[PDB]
Design a protein around this ligand. Structure first.
Ligand SMILES: COc1cc2ncnc3c2cc1OCCOCCOCCOc1ccc(Cl)cc1N3
Length: 304
């Protein structure tokens, strides 16, 4: 191959018979996420799943985006990345993925802030750095890393999801150039705002904002600031403030992800090392007051 490696991920087409929706987890304008049970026919297993369905197939552009997402989700495999189990084509395109029962990490930290200690926070930081580093290996720029897009399998185990903006860099490319469409401005590197240039180092900036979300127990970045005003305030030198529980050691890691020169920001592989060292003595780096279901198989244990 004159360039990249053949993507031999498998795309599993699942029968609608094989799974049963249980509850709505959430509805948007473009569709709904359900929780359900998948039961591969020949297997004596029931697998808890989230089922993400496009509301109405009457939007070829939409069907094209959700299939782009499924391509990406089908091609990743890492303990800290959400992988696609299969798709269902019935009338509405449905993505089937492993159910992450505690939901997204942003709502988790807001709901349980009075019971979240430094060990958890720094461990999450390690696990997200691991997921992102693995995506960097796969030459994949996420473009929407945020605490809303980290899911909670258990309080000890989180994974990166929402690959709807993710782009695959080529072997001869280093940057992605996008063209319109709503983008999460308050998580975007300055180069992404100004020139719509995206890089793994652009993702590192987003990682900085995501850590800041966690350390503030789900605070909104630049709360009350118009998204249009963000470009200018970031040029002037302004950054997110030091969260109360953060030592200078941790806040300085966050600030380095927000260096204007993108190459002098940390590598995800370095963020793994630094937070892992910190997670080894958590109270030195965060200061927090008070520190039939018989055939059910989690998806991480169903491997075909
Ligand atoms: C317990 O609540 C939930 C558990 C889930 N477990 C697995 N997957 C979920 C889940 C969604 C849940 O609540 C909906 C709110 O989510 C917050 C935003 O989500 C970002 C992206 O999420 C996805 C992206 C692609 C696919 Cl195929 C599926 C999901 N969603």
């Amino acid at each position: 191959t004159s360039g990249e490696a053949p993507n031999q991920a498998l795309l599993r087409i699942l029968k609608e018979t094989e799974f049963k929706k249980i509850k709505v987890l959430g509805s948007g304008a473009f569709g709904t996420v359900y929780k359900g049970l998948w039961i591969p026919e020949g297997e004596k297993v029931k697998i808890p799943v989230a089922i993400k369905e496009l509301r109405e197939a009457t939007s070829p552009k939409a069907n094209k985006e959700i299939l782009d997402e499924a391509y990406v989700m089908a091609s990743v495999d890492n303990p800290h990345v959400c992988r696609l189990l299969g798709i269902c084509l019935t009338s509405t395109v449905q993505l089937i993925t492993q159910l992450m029962p505690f939901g997204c990490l942003l709502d988790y930290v807001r709901e349980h802030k009075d019971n979240i200690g430094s060990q958890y926070l720094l461990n999450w930081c390690v696990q997200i750095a691991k997921g992102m580093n693995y995506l960097e290996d796969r030459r994949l720029v996420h473009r929407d890393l945020a605490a809303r897009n980290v899911l909670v399998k258990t309080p000890q185990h989180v994974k990166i999801t929402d690959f709807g903006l993710a782009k695959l860099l080529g072997a001869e490319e280093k940057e992605y150039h996008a063209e319109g469409g709503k983008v999460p401005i308050k998580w975007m590197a300055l180069e992404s705002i100004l020139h719509r240039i995206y890089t793994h180092q652009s993702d590192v900036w987003s990682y900085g904002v995501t850590v800041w979300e966690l350390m503030t127990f789900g605070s909104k970045p630049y709360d009350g600031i118009p998204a249009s005003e963000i470009s200018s305030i970031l040029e002037k030198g302004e950054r997110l403030p030091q969260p109360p529980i953060c030592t200078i050691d941790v806040y300085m890691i966050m600030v380095k992800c927000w260096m204007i020169d993108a190459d002098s920001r940390p590598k995800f592989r370095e963020l793994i090392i630094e937070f892992s060292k910190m997670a080894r003595d958590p109270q030195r780096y965060l200061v927090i007051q008070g520190d039939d279901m018989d055939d059910v198989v989690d998806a991480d244990e169903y491997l075909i």
